[PDB]
Amino acid sequence: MNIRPLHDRVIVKRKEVETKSAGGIVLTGSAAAKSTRGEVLAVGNGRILENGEVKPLDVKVGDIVIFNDGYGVKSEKIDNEEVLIMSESDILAIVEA
Amino acid sequence: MNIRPLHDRVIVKRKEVETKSAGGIVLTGSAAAKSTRGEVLAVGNGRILENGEVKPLDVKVGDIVIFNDGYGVKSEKIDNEEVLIMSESDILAIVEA
Amino acid sequence: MNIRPLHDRVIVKRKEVETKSAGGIVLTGSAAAKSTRGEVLAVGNGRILENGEVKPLDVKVGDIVIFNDGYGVKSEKIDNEEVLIMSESDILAIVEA
Amino acid sequence: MNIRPLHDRVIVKRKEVETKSAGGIVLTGSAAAKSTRGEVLAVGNGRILENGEVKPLDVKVGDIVIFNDGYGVKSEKIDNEEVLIMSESDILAIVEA
Amino acid sequence: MNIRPLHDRVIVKRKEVETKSAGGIVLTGSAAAKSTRGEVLAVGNGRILENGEVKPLDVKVGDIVIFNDGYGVKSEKIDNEEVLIMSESDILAIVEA
Amino acid sequence: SNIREMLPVLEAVAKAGKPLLIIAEDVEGEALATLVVNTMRGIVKVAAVKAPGFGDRRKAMLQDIATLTGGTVISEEIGMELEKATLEDLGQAKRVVINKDTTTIIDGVGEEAAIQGRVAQIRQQIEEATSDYDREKLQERVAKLAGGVA
Amino acid sequence: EEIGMELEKATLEDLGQAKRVVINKDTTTIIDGVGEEAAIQGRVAQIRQQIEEATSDYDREKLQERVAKLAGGVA
């Protein structure tokens, strides 16, 4: 079973936290920090604000993105895996090829 | 890997803080101050306000700009380097010639 | 190497601080007060608000103005001297004669 | 000789503070209170909000008004006299008869 | 002299505070309270919002009204009497007959 | 401390290419750190020492040092400011000697009329009702101004 | 740290060199750092003022110990 997001909501999963490759071949331990990179599992219908139609999201399924982990970011457990739910506004940028 | 901004968002990097050239050949150390100059690494699609089309940004990639370091400015680490994320509105001026 | 302001931004320079002509013949030393008068070095294109066209600024380069030094006012140094950057809104009046 | 206010800005001068005519014959000493009445020296062009036309101010030059002395009220010295600068919104009423 | 309120301003006078006839045929002492009822001495032109026309005030001169004594309520002394100045929004209801 | 500002005074000396001697209530590491590096590369040769002692005590003896060397004392308290002071306001001496516990000036360049004038105002100080302690410290200043100390 | 230097600000070349060191719970030893004699003697030469000190007691005792370690031996 899988999950269907509601308009302007994007479901993404978090990547590895403080991966041991910082500074070159140097191994970096965890300084109690958390990973800001994720992958887009699902895309909502779009934003329904200003009134004129429904505006489509700029993020396509399967994208790799950078986002700000704020209040708008929620945590759920699907098929015993951790996922994140946030709006389009939260995701700052896309990592490409 | 690299970053693609999400419309009206500009990714820039901060320049040297209180470079030791103040008042002449005098070497001035850093004593509680920060640099407001930067370079534009990436340009977003444009503003999405008022529904009618999307307006393009006034700053090209690689420009040297002066900006207001306010709340609207976010910090992320890319390829283990510091970058700044802010809107077009937050960038005060462009250094030319 | 001069500076070009970005729309709705005006670059001005501050005049002499707490000039000793207050009260009468008496010369008043600076207790800890700052001068609110300035000269307009540069003028931006205008206000871009509400899409349709751009509205021109009401101040011409070289004017002598009175302004409110608030949060909006910012300070930068070019050609080794102090300048101020603020919007049209922050300038309260023009001194004429 | 005089100052020209910007649109939606009104220049007024403050009247007598805690005038000695309260309760009739009795002279009331000034116990930390300030006068809210003034005279309108100058009138700006008007409000420029929401593009369509510039709306004219409802206050005539030379009128006697009651106003709310808040943050929006600024103080300047003209020909060595005290003046106040505030928007139309800050002026509560007009004294007639 | 008398006072003329500016648009969307109503000048009213406060009625008796803690009138003695509370809880039955009982004279009640002024333990610590104020009166929310007043009379409308003057009427301003009306609200000036959204451009198209000026909307007239619903309350005619001489009405008996109920109001919320908040920040928006200001006090001035006219002809040695206490009056209140507030907007239309402040006055909650009208006492009739 | 962060009272570093006085750069135009400092650079004026750098422009001159001569060493600078500093007398004040105190100097903190922020000013000293930059000063050490500036001296090390030869930009400026500058060393700073503390004033004689108690506020009234040090302030009283500052004028004579300045007048003796032809310099001007900066009155923070009065009509003067940190930056506000020209290079010409600085006093001049042939050379100075400094150690961990003592500061010495070989010879400041000042007019005899000014040296004597400082001494002349001392005469009221010399004939004093207090006598004990007042005269002892007072004379020491006097000997230093034109005589010698043994 | 106090003067013109910073934590990061320092190149590997800045670091000193030695053949080997010996360390235990209460003691640290360096077999032989590689430095020039002129620098070793120069440190010792500046010590001569330190040697001829008015205080004598305590000042000389600690001072001599540094001296013995710099070029001589400690018993």
Q: Which of B2, B4, B41, B86 to mutate to test the interface with A (most CBs of A within 10 A)?
A: B4
Q: Which chain B residues are Cβ-neighbours of F2 within 8 angstroms? A: 31
Domain boundaries, chain C: 1-97
Residue B57's CB: how many other CB atoms inside 10 A?
20
Chains that touch D (3 or more CB pairs under 8 A): C, E
**A93 to B5: CB separation less than 8 angstroms, yes or no:** yes
Number of H helices, E strands in chain F: 5, 4
Q: In chain C, whose CA is at the least distance from the CA of B88? A: C6
C-alpha span between A17 and A32 (Å, rounded) = 10
C-alpha span between E29 and D17 (Å, rounded) = 36
DSSP per-residue string spanning B14-79 = E--SS-S-TTSS------S----EEEEEEE-S-B-TTSSS-BPPS--TT-EEEE--STT-EEEEET
Nearest to E4 among D23, D53, D94 (CB): D94
**A96 to B4: CB separation less than 8 angstroms, yes or no:** yes
Q: At what angle do helices F55-69 and F134-146 cross, to 10 degrees?
A: 20
Category of C51 on φ-ψ map: left (φ > 0), alpha (ψ -120 to 50) or beta: left
Is the CB of residue A40 less than 8 Å from the CB of residue A62? yes
Which residue in A73, A43, A57, A83 sits closest to B6, CA to CA? A57
According to the CATH classification, is domain B1-97 in 2.30.33.40? yes
**E11 to D93: CB separation less than 8 angstroms, yes or no:** yes
* C vs D: CB pairs below 8 A: 25
Nearest to D93 among E51, E77, E85 (CB): E85
Tokens of F112: 């005899």
List, in sequence order, every beta strand (DSSP E) within D5-49: 9-14, 37-43
Q: In chain C, whose CA is at the least distance from the CA of B91? A: C6
C-alpha span between E12 and E67 (Å, rounded) = 10
Question: For residue G39, what is the DSSP state?
Answer: H
C-alpha span between B70 and B83 (Å, rounded) = 14
Resolution (A): 15.9
Q: Which chain G residues are Cβ-neighbours of F29 within 8 angstroms? A: 2
**D76 to C92: CB separation less than 8 angstroms, yes or no:** yes
With a CB cutoff of 8 Å and minimum separation 6, the contacts of A60 are: A40, A43
DSSP per-residue string spanning E16-82 = -SS-S--SSS-----SS----EEEEEEE-S-B--SSSS-BPPSPPTT-EEEE--STT-EEEEETTEE
Nearest to B29 among F8, F10, F34 (CB): F34
CA distance to partner chain C, nearest, from residue D95 (Å): 27
For C77, counting Cβ atoms within 10 Å of its Cβ (0-12 exposed, 13-18 middle, 19+ buried), the class is exposed
Is the CB of residue F93 less than 8 Å from the CB of residue F18? no
With a CB cutoff of 8 Å and minimum separation 6, the contacts of G45 are: none
Beta bridge partners of C11: C42, C85
Residue E77's CB: how many other CB atoms inside 10 A?
10
**C92 to D9: CB separation less than 8 angstroms, yes or no:** yes
The amino acid at residue F30 is: E
CA distance to partner chain C, nearest, from residue B92 (Å): 6
Way it was determined:
cryo-EM
Tokens of F58: 């040090």
Is the CB of residue A47 less than 8 Å from the CB of residue A8? yes
Tokens of B84: 């700044």
CA distance to partner chain F, nearest, from residue B30 (Å): 10
Question: For residue A30, what is the DSSP state?
Answer: P
SS3 E94: strand
Between positions 17 and 36 of E, the ones with CB within 8 A of D are none
Cα angle for residues D48, D50, D55 (degrees, 5° grid): 40
DSSP per-residue string spanning D12-81 = EEE--SS-TTTTSSPPPP--S----EEEEEEE-S-B-TTSSS-BPPS--TT-EEEE--STT-EEEEETTE
C-alpha span between A20 and A17 (Å, rounded) = 9
